[PDB]
Amino acid sequence: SFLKEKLAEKIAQHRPRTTRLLKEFGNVKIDEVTISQAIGGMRGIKSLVTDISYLDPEEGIRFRGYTIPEVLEKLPKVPGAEMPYVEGHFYLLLTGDVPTEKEVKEVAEEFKKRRALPEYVKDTLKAMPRDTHPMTMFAAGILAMQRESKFAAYYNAGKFNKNTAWEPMFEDAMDLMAKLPSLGAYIYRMKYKSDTHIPSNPDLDLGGDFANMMGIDKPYDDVARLYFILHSDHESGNVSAHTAHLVASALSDAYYAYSAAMCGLAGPLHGLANQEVLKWIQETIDKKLGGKVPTKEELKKFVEETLSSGQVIPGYGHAVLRKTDPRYVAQREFALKHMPDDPIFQVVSMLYEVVPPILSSLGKVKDPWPNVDAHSGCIQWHYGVVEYDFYTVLFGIGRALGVLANLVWDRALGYAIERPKSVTTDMLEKWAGIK
């Protein structure tokens, strides 16, 4: 494929840079580690390398150098629709290049060929109790398809070569990425839509076919394209991306690695904030504002009561972001266009205005600004995706774009097994000078 050959070129150009940094500049110091950071989840330690995306604390995420407005502007659009082909964003994350129309169509055609779900995946999800959480089903579906791993068969056949290993990793990434939306849709239908299924439309792109198979009309196709692109990557240090990277570093294939990643994304501190924001807004509308859209005044003081009574505003704050999330901003622009009169959006909008000034005053949250999770839920809810637990599956579909691109590159550049060193509490006490 043109995509694979393009990627081979980019790998040939990049490898010497990595070789040189190790050969000449291996010992250059880039950060330090404190007791606080070792105890506190490696917080802020610059210990990972990725080029897929980079999270700037001030500017937010850049994908392959580009801002979100730039990505949405430059990527080829689906005919008849507002948003880019998700396939085109995948091309960008893999290669660093904005694809031409011709180049995106080739990826879209390849995804059409690879998007069918193995029957045994459906068998497996049916054998799992139907009351199983959708993220458990999602991770299990990915894991079961490890049977098809080209990377694993390559390794098991004795063919491993450090120069060529990215190639079967790429094939697995294409196979998995093409299928994840269908897997998600299957779970949505089987759990929440009476277990009736809408067949894949082989003429639709990834995002369009996802909306089709979910059973949701235009413009949910664009909602999904946007959602997936925004959630595509957030560098490699987030729990889900890091988990994939870590697992793959032991030369586990992408099915093992991405299944593991979804186990991390399932975590309340990683994949739940969207639904927790939305629930909190819906409860606020109902209990604190008598079921009605409030004034800027009424909400301004509602916020202060929640804060001064010792509780968080959900969807505000972040481990790394220190300014407004540009992913949040893109969601906002979509909502302003398509659902300006939606009651829940109106509260989201007003929260944007009133909450940052207030959080800044108290000066206690290092990021007194919204992240995407403040915005995503009102859009999903508007279009009738009311099934909160499933929101994380949407995230998992999206995040695979960047993570699978990252795994291809980890193998391209021969990144070594991730294996830091542990220390005991005694050892920390020794270093601290405690007796």
Next chain:
Amino acid sequence: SFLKEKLAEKIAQHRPRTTRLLKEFGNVKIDEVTISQAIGGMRGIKSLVTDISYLDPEEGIRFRGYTIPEVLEKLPKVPGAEMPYVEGHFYLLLTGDVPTEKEVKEVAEEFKKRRALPEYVKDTLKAMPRDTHPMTMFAAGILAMQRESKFAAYYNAGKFNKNTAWEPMFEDAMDLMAKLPSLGAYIYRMKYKSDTHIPSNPDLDLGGDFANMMGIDKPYDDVARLYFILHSDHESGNVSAHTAHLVASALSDAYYAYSAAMCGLAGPLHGLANQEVLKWIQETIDKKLGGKVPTKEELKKFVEETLSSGQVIPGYGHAVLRKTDPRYVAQREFALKHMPDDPIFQVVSMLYEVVPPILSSLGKVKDPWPNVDAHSGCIQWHYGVVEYDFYTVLFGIGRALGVLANLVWDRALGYAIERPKSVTTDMLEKWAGIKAA
């Protein structure tokens, strides 16, 4: 339970120490990060904290302060058998204390109550194609049981409290640990023993019942007890333990976390060395030594040919160990006792003698010494566990002892979400002085 109350005491004593390190000494520097280390998988960076076990590069692994000879010596033994109750090792990893016989029996009784496998786990493994790799089945079985998570139900009911969160995590750890051997055995029977099943014996301990359900006679019960204890933990920085820790740090339950861990352990650079050693020895016996146990002389030069022709001796070397693995030594002592005349063991033994001197000369492997994976396979093979792919499942059963103990403590001590920062190649080039024009 006495175990849970003992653990509660240990947590009460430990928490203030963690609080003090953060309050008073948070900014004390303990290490740095270089370009080499960021590119090279955080190699050597002291960025994780665990008390379950500590890997010394020279002395090897210590479990709660104790060496392997000490653990095997002090832990109560199963009556009529040579090796400790695995349950007693779990007590040690959880509490830091060597249990009395009374204390181990209480854990053994609790494991008996928790060991039955949900039928839907069997349903799920049957729906998965039978030609699925056993580690994929193993991870899937763990994952499916996420449905039963007490930690997840606790969280979902709005009950999360940073002081009490360890408690449902402990319950899940006990539930999962009790079941993992049965899950493993199920997979073994369904894939490799014609899909006939030997029922759990409710009077056997964890290791004994595992051998029972596998269909393997004494002394495989002791093989398993020893195997599981040796593989129990290797601090938190190994890929499988770290994966569990990382996933759980986002407050994912133990089923999500340990399933994720087995995805990592399945990796060729993590969970395959046992079977790769054994295959390489069996191929060596057959092709390079005409199906016969060689002389120290013949093997000494066979090694040099493999090395100087640009290939590794499997089961030698390590990311962190710089001396002989004491886990290897314990395996050796078992083999000397129980199978001194086994052809494959004899080659393993002779490799112990001849390979370190040679690897030291060439001075190219930072650890010119064996790890466990050099020894485990000849023991499994001797007792008729010929199914190479399954060896990693044995590892996964064992490693849960330390990893699940570690997750309970991560929650006890409120360890925060693991979230390091990424950098680009451009940024490394800037720091190196190649860029900034």
